[PDB]
Every structure is written in structure tokens, then in C-alpha cells.
Amino acid sequence: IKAVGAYSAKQPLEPMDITRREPGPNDVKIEIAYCGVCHSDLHQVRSEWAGTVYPCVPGHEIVGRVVAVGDQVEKYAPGDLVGVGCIVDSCKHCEECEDGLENYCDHMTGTYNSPTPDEPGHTLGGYSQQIVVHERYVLRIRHPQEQLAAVAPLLCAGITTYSPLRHWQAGPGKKVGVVGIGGLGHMGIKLAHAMGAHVVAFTTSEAKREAAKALGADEVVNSRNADEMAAHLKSFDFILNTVAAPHNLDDFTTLLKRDGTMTLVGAPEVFNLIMKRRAIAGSMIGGIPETQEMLDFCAEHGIVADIEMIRADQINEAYERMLRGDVKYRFVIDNRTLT
């Protein structure tokens, strides 16, 4: 099984062979077609303090076709179009898992870098030809097969924004802000718009103003222009901040209505929180049930990510561009190019 991974934090991703466990009774064997490139992949293979275990094979925005299934699998059959996100296992018996929030389980097994009985001791991600996952964590893709690659980013970037939008009830009659026009930001705008909310996108440069409009934002604000920001004082029900290194959170807090919340999902003057009972929260990905709901919703609405397909040997160059925001708006690996 071919894949692409790193041997150390300072070594660029390179070709390497890995192994996969034989499908167990509840397992689904998947032939990976495409894998989205997430900033978490970059961080994992480069960050010194990511607790990264090598070799490291990133990738967790996986879509492909079922090759085989265990004798106890009830959800899938060979030929099915499926997806895998950031979770491949969880304890299944804690309050979070029982509530369909496996993403918040204290013992959640991540698609990559988590301990597992499978060789070599830690999970290897989607930058590979195949993956074997317990059916509870495998999602069903309902989009037409021609859109598989564009569906890939939904498995992480998509759910990461979909989950909080749903949790804070974005929808008709709600004014929702989306900060950042990158991989996460573009999905936040697409989804908030599809949910029926009045969407305001925030950027730090005039260069991406038209781009935000094109994504579905009803209004766009350059957060560096005080006049533009002031026009939205105390008007937002919810603000989804997707910027990696969010700045001027004070400015955004003042844009929230009473009882409003700004949730951060990217990788604060108390006075402003107190005066209107506002809150700042965080959120990461989503549980499996909601990830499935999101995929169904996106399939019915024809929602997919805007992507740029690349070869498996171009991931290092892709990372460089991602750091400059030089992609519109998600890189997706054509896993067939592994061979």
C-alpha cells in the first residue's frame, strides 16, 4: 500500500509503503480516491510540539469506494461511495460517544497520529491508497461520483464549520458572520448561505472582497476598516471565526448582539462580554451522526468545496501555497497518482 509521509519534522513528505489491518467483522476496507489537504496535516508533519509519531502519514478528508466489508457490517457494501474524516474510533460508551459526539471523546482515535493495535502502533492517514475503518466512523457519500474530489474537504473543513453553524442555530432570520476566506472560511460562507442565514464575510484585505461575494456572502467587510466594522455594531447573532491566528477579537465581540456568541474553529476585553452577556466559544469538527447529516444536506443542495487537484508528490509545494493562502480554496490529492 503506497502512501506519502514524513520521517521527521524537518523532512519533506516522501513516498513510503505502509500496511493496513485485515478487515475485521465491523470493518470497511476503502480504496481511497481523493484526500483533501488540511492545515492540520501541515502542522502535524512540521510542528515540533505536535506530539507527532513517525513515520507520519497525514490526511483526513478522505473519500473513496468500499472494496470489502466485514461480516458484521450493516451500513455498507462493496461499491459504495464513502468518506472518512478526522475520527476512526472512539470509546463508544462515554457521554460524548453516546450523544453522537465522538469528536469530543477523551479517547477518540484520530485518523492519524493516535495509538492503535495496528502496525506500526499509531494511525496512518489518507495520503495513501487504502484505509480500513470501523463502519461506525465511515460516512456515506450521496453526491454524484463525478463530484467525489470536491466532496473530500467536507470531511473536515466542511463539518468543522457546519457543526457550529448548526449548534448556534444559523438559519433564516439570523445574521451570521464568517471571519476568514480560506479553506474553512469558504465552507463557512457556502454552508451559512445554504442554511438561509444573512451572511457577512470578513477579510483583512480588499483583494478577497469579490471572492467572498462569489462564495455566497450577502455582505463583505474589510475588518481593517473601522468604518466598515462600525456599521455592524451589535448586530450579529453568531460569528464563526475561522482564522488560524485571529486578531482584534475585541472588534468582533462588539459586533455581537446581546447573548450573541463568536466561536473560533481555526488552528478579548472582558468588558465587552459583560455588557451584553456575550460569549467566546470554540468547536472542533463534528460527531459522526452530524457529519452524515452534513453530507446528506450537501448532496441534496449540490454543495461541494472549491478545489485544486494535485498529484501526491506535490503536497510539499501545496503546503507552501496554503501558508500564503494561495489556493481557491482547498487542495485535493488525486490518490491514483500514488502509483
What residues are designated binding site for Zn(2+)?
Answer: 38, 60, 91, 94, 97, 105, 156
Nearest to 172 by CA among 208, 201, 199: 199
Binding mask 136-175 for Zn ion (x = CB under 5 A): --------------------x-------------------
Q: Which residues bind its own copies (CB under 8 A)?
A: 95-96, 101, 104, 106, 167, 234, 246, 258, 261, 264-265, 268, 270-284
Secondary structure of residue 163 in the 3-state scheme = helix
CB of 6 closer than 8 Å to CB of 124: no
Distances (CA, A) of 285 to 60, 101, 154, 202, 228: 11, 10, 10, 21, 31
Q: Which does 275 bind (CB under 5 to 8 A by kind): its own copies, Zn ion, none?
A: its own copies
User: What is the distance between the alpha carbons of residues 196 and 175, in angstroms, rounded to a whole number?
Assistant: 10
Secondary structure of residue 130 in the 3-state scheme = strand
On the 0-12 / 13-18 / 19+ scale of CB atoms within 10 A, 78 is exposed
Binding mask 31-50 for Zn ion (x = CB under 5 A): -------x-x----------
Q: Which does 97 bind (CB under 5 to 8 A by kind): its own copies, Zn ion, none?
A: Zn ion
Q: Is 299 in the site for Zn ion (CB under 5 A)?
A: no
Shortest approach of its own copies to residue 272 CB, angstroms? 8
Beta bridge partners of 332: 36, 309
User: What is the distance between the alpha carbons of residues 279 and 33, in angstroms, rounded to a whole number?
Assistant: 41
Q: Which does 281 bind (CB under 5 to 8 A by kind): Zn ion, its own copies, none?
A: its own copies
Binding mask 97-136 for Zn ion (x = CB under 5 A): x-------x-------------------------------
Sequence ranges of the binding site = 38, 60, 91, 94, 97, 105, 156
Sole binder of Zn ion in the list 23, 36, 37, 90 (CB under 5 A): 90
Q: How many helices (H) and strands (E) would you count in the chain?
A: 11, 17
Q: Is 91 in the site for Zn ion (CB under 5 A)?
A: yes
Neighbours of 220 (CB within 10 A): 21
Q: Which does 261 bind (CB under 5 to 8 A by kind): Zn ion, its own copies, none?
A: its own copies
Shortest approach of its own copies to residue 129 CB, angstroms? 32
The stretches of the chain forming alpha helices (DSSP H) are 39-46, 95-98, 148-151, 157-167, 183-194, 209-215, 226-230, 249-253, 270-274, 288-301, 315-323
Q: Which does 176 bind (CB under 5 to 8 A by kind): its own copies, Zn ion, none?
A: none
Sole binder of Zn ion in the list 16, 53, 94, 309 (CB under 5 A): 94
